[PDB]
Amino acid sequence: PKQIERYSRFSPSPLSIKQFLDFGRDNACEKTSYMFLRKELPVRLANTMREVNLLPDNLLNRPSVGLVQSWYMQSFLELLEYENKSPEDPQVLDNFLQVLIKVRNRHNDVVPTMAQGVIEYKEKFGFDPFISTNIQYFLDRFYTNRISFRMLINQHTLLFGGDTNPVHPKHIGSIDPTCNVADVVKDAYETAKMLCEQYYLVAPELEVEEFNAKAPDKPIQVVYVPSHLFHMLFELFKNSMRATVELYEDRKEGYPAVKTLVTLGKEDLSIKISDLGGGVPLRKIDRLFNYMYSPLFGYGLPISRLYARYFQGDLKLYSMEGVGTDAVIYLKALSSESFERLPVFNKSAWRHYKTTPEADDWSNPSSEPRDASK
Amino acid sequence: PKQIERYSRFSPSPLSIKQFLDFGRDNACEKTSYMFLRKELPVRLANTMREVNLLPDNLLNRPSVGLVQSWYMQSFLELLEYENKSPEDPQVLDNFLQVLIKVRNRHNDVVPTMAQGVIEYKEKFGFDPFISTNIQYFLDRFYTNRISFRMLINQHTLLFGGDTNPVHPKHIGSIDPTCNVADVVKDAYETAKMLCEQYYLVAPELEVEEFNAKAPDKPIQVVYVPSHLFHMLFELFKNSMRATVELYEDRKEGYPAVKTLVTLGKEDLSIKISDLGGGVPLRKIDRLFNYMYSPLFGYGLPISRLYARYFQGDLKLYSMEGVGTDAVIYLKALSSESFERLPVFNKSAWRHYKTTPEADDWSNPSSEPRDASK
Amino acid sequence: SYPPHMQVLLPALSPTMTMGTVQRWEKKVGEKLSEGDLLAEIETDKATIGFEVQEEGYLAKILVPEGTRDVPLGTPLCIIVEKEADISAFADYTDLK
Amino acid sequence: SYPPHMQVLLPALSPTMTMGTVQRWEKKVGEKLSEGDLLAEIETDKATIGFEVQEEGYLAKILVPEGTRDVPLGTPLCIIVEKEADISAFADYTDLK
Ligand SMILES: [K+]
Ligand SMILES: [K+]
């Protein structure tokens, strides 16, 4: 772990959608990409690994965590072999490509393997206050870095993997320069609908409105990675369909639609999914994104919000208890403003793992407050 | 400041709406109230004063800050005179009542005097990163404690001030046990409308819907302090009317209404104010509550949200850039759950004032990112 | 005799407090104690209060266990020792300048 | 000679970095320096990087001012001193065991 210390001390290089796009469209030079990736991937893994060693020992101990850790170690070492292998040999270029595939595969089960880890740990050591927010901090960071490894590898393999007949030929690697939002909305809806109908024997209708303030009649389009957006929309539709269908399964009313507004402004692309599924009290909202309070692995909402924040977007929920809930995805309108947001290991990060519980800042009532009548 | 150290080390006693109500309705014993308040008010002032001494010296220096500080000192000392004056003498009871009036008056200008302070400081030392969030932290706490002094004093003076013919006789001090929400909504609207019409020569119509999941047809009512709720609604209506009127003043369209949904569930009373005033990009939202980024003193949104959080409620905004904005006030449905939320001075608080800037946790791009085409 | 040691007494944490429940220890025997660390939650009739470490050391022993209600003011609550060597000496239950 | 002192050199803060702009000092001459405090923002072509204090001390002098672009690796950036007495000695521009 001397190599890990050193690489963990390196800072990630966040890339923008613009850069990915400009690189794949205009340039598409494998040398450049390899030289970038042979350094960037170990940097990213080492930053994450350093944080995994800061977990409480009771969590670090779980076989699942250990397995994840050795998978990363194994990837880091395999990548480190290229530090002094020259791009001028095209042979090296080819093997590196194979190594990328090899580590994408090896990392296929990371998300649920980690999930198993923290479940193991909770159902064996219990749910505590400060530790929870600590694991929260860690998982956001860990799953984001993981999304980003996958992004980088996919760009390289799609662009240089030499795929004879590629599924989406207008796409640039995994980036759609003219991603049509309503299409992804409809697709995500149809696939939630299918699962909802399978189990509940019924599902709400979708309604979609657009408002393009940029140019009012014209279909709303974004430069984006469709399957990220797909993923986000799918999770929200699944929730909205389940809430709606559960609320009306005993009512004579007839099921309300699940509505979508898509808007495009000078800087935000916004997508608001609205349902009348009865809503959620405010106190339960923040917990919807807390991994370890979590019919149809409940990491769906927190992960989706990680996809949104990953390119400087965000994902937010607002409910009215008694009526319904709005979920909004915000994306940057401009590819030039859509930078990767990456967890950087440094002293700031270290401090979060070493935070000992502190007195509350703000008052807390007694759980048996004095009876003011007597 | 030995007495201030000691009292600043005391913990506030947060009270609930239930307690205020139960006290005024069922009990209403002046002795009890005086004994409580002679201790609680100095505690609260001392907790705040201790935090004001932790401000940066450049802000501490501003005459306005110094003035606020000596006003507090002067109140603290006046209150401390009652520590050993017995409630059995009704004379003492009367003078204490006069002292409360005296300090409510003295504190009449605190909000804008402090505001002057931080403006003085900004327009003379500039807007910086970490310091800003520090002042933010401080003002939230300071203005909340201030709202709470005022609450406590008002309860005592309204209940024991001996007012022959009180304005609202069904009210218990300042608390309305059957506060009808739509009425406060309509009132707040009418008074924003008047100011908006005065300047813009036009104003949107209000539309109000209710959904009482508790009991569907029945008007929605809450145990609450009407003028807090009034204050919140007024600020939101003012914003919504200004946004709407500004957007349509050059359009042939005809002005959209400002809509209000009021809902009541098992635990939340929610009030959503919606306008089609064109919205606000996400990046500008968090700043709407940052005191020092702030026609028709811009502390209105941050203060309103302080009123909501003061009884365990909250105030949130969600916009769609290009279309409009939703603002939601959440209140607790149950008086038994509506505790004061009070700033406690302790080491946790101290730490916020002594936080030295730290490296960002998460990556930041270059401001001139490498051109990936070249 | 015993090694140099401090006794943590339950203060009145609020002007009217005469007793409190020790609702939760936030430190373990053996653990380092920095000034201002959270030590325990004390519950009264008025509030739930984060009680802070006033002096730095190491937690030597807990004299009052979680859950004990109505603990009066002055009751010793735990023992604090300057050096971790000395924690052992206390599982048995003024050079402290 | 001069009092015992450390020179802070600009590391490669990222594997491909060969130079950077010193975009902002986050410490003042005179100020205490704890390990891990933020020292400066370094800007490259790739990122804006919070550069951290690696060793504790006191900032003695700034050898490179805010705004200096393209500072190469190895360039000394500032001086750190063990004791605050010694800061004075440096406005003039190995017992450090
Ligand atoms: K790092
Ligand atoms: K206090």
What is the full DSSP assignment across B58-98?
A: HHHTSHHHHHHHHHHHHHHHHHHTTTTS-TTSHHHHHHHHH
CA B34 to centroid of chain Cα atoms: 25
Which amino acid would we find at residue A326?
Answer: D
Catalytic residue among A107, A156, A228, A238: A238
Tokens of A253: 């009313």
> Do residues B239 and B315 touch, judged by C-beta distance below 8 A?
no
Residue C14 to residue B43, Cβ atoms within 8 A: yes
Cβ contact A12–D47 (<8 Å): yes
Q: In chain A, which residues are followed by a C-to-N distance beyond 2.5 Å, i.e. a gap? A: 294, 296
Kind and range of the H or E run holding B330: strand B324-332
Nearest ligand atom owner, CA of A347: 1
Q: Which of B323, B347, B358, B370 to mutate to test the interface with A (most CBs of A within 10 A)?
A: B323
Annotated binding site of B for ATP: 235-242, 275, 294, 297-301
Fold of domain A1-160: Butyryl-CoA Dehydrogenase, subunit A; domain 3 (1.20.140)
Q: Left, alpha or beta for A369 (phi > 0: left; psi -120 to 50: alpha)? A: beta
Is the CB of residue A367 less than 8 Å from the CB of residue C45?
no
A307: nearest Cα among A270, A341, A343, A335: A341
Strand order in the sheet with D32-33: D5-9, D76-81, D57-62, D32-33
Residue A107 known to be catalytic: no
Tokens coding A137: 């901090």
How far is C-alpha B166 from the geometric centre of its chain's CA atoms?
Answer: 25
Distance CA(B174)–CA(B171), nearest Å, equals 6
Residue keyed to tokens 């502190």:
A358
User: Under 8 Å CB-to-CB from B22, ≥6 apart: which residues?
Assistant: A371, A372, A373
What's the CA-to-centroid distance between A47 and ligand 1, angstroms?
6
Task: Report the separation in Å between the CA atom of B43 and the middle of ligand 2, taken as the mean of its atom positions.
Answer: 8
B27, closest residue in chain A (CA to CA): A373
Q: Do B347 and C16 touch (CB under 8 A)?
A: no
- Measured CA to CA in angstroms, residue B98 lies from A162, A240, B147 at distances of 87, 57, 20
Beta bridge partners of B70: none
D9 exposure class (CB count in 10 Å sphere: 0-12, 13-18, 19+): exposed
User: Which partners does chain A have (≥3 C-beta pairs < 8 Å)?
Assistant: B, C, D
A259 - beta bridge partners? A207, A274
Specify which residues A318 forms β-bridges with: A326
Chain B: residue nearest C42 by CA?
B11
Domain ranges within chain B, ordered by starting residue: 1-160, 172-341
| Range list of β-strands (E), B213-253 | 221-224
Neighbours of B370 (CB within 10 A): 16
Q: Cα separations (Å) of B8 from B45, C42, C44, C52, D39?
A: 8, 18, 18, 14, 34
Torsional class of A162: left (φ above 0), alpha (ψ -120 to 50), beta (otherwise): left
* Maximum distance among all Cα pairs of chain A, rounded to whole angstroms: 88
Q: Is A165 on the interface with C (CB under 8 A)?
A: no
Residues of A numbered 6-65 whose beta carbons fall under 8 angstroms of chain D's beta carbons: which are they?
7, 10-14, 36, 39-40, 43
Q: Which residues sit opposite A347 in a β-bridge?
A: none
> In degrees, to the nearest 5, what angle opens at C-alpha A249 toward C-alphas A245 and A254?
80
Give the count of beta carbons closer than 10 Å to the beta carbon of residue A284.
13
Ligand nearest to the CA of A360: 2
- Cβ contacts (< 8 Å) between D44 and chain B: which residues? 366
Farthest-apart Cα atoms in chain D, separation: 41
Amino acid, res. A334: L
Q: d(Cα A95, Cα A65) in Å, to the nearest integer? A: 29
H-helix or E-strand containing A324?
Answer: strand A324-332
Q: Give the neighbours of chain D: at least 3 Cβ pairs within 8 Å.
A: A, B
**Measured distance CA(D48)–CA(B363) in Å, rounded:** 8
Tokens of B205: 């119509």
Asked if the Cβ–Cβ distance from B347 to C49 is below 8 Å, we say: no
Catalytic positions of B are 231, 235, 238-239
- Give the whole-angstrom CA distance, residue D55 versus residue A11: 19
- PDB experimental method: X-ray
Resolution of the deposited coordinates, in angstroms?
2.6
For the beta carbon of residue C7, count every other beta carbon within 10 angstroms.
11
Going by C-beta distance under 8 Å and a sequence separation of 6 or more, which residues neighbour residue B110?
B68, B71, B146
* Full strand arrangement of the beta sheet holding C32-33: C5-9, C76-81, C57-62, C32-33
Q: Which of B358, B364, B370 sits opposite D48 (nearest CB)?
A: B364
**Residue B359 and residue A233: Cα distance in Å, rounded?**
34
Helix, strand, or coil (residue B341): coil
Question: Exposed, middle or buried by CB within 10 Å (0-12, 13-18, 19+), for C11?
Answer: middle
- What's the C27 CA to ligand 2 centre distance in angstroms? 21
CATH number assigned to the domain with residue range B172-341, chosen from the 4 options 1.10.275.10, 3.40.50.1980, 3.40.50.300, 3.30.565.10: 3.30.565.10
Contact B100, B157 (CB under 8 A): yes
Inter-residue contact B238 to B300 (CB < 8 Å): yes
Question: Which of helix, strand or coil describes residue A213?
Answer: coil
* Phi (first) and psi of residue B155, to 5 degrees: -65, -50
- Cβ neighbors of A67 (< 8 A, separation 6 or more) are A113
Which residue bears the tokens 């607002």? A318
Distance of alpha carbon A117 from alpha carbon A120, whole angstroms: 5
Tell me the β-bridge partners of B357: none
Active site residue A235: yes
Nearest ligand, measured from the Cα of B45: 2
Closest CA of chain C from A355, distance in Å: 10
CA atoms of A199 and A294, how far apart (whole Å): 21
Helix (H) or strand (E) holding A96: helix A90-106
Residue A119, Ramachandran bin (φ over 0: left; ψ between -120 and 50: alpha; else beta): alpha
**Option in B356, B360, B366 nearest D46 (CB):** B366
- Would you state the structure tokens that stand for residue A209, as one six-digit string? 């409105």
| Cα B195-B197-B203 angle, rounded to 5 deg | 115
Measured in Å, residue D7 CA sits from the centre of ligand 1 at 22
Domains of chain C by start residue, with CATH: 1-97 (2.40.50.100)
Test C38 with A357 for CB contact under 8 angstroms. Answer: yes
Residues of C with CB under 8 A from a CB of B: 13-16, 35-37, 46-47, 49-50, 52
Question: How near does any CA of chain B get to the CA of D1, in Å?
Answer: 33
CA-based diameter of chain B, in Å? Answer: 88
- CATH topology agreement for domains B1-160 and B172-341: no
Rounded distance, CA B114 to CA B111, Å?
5
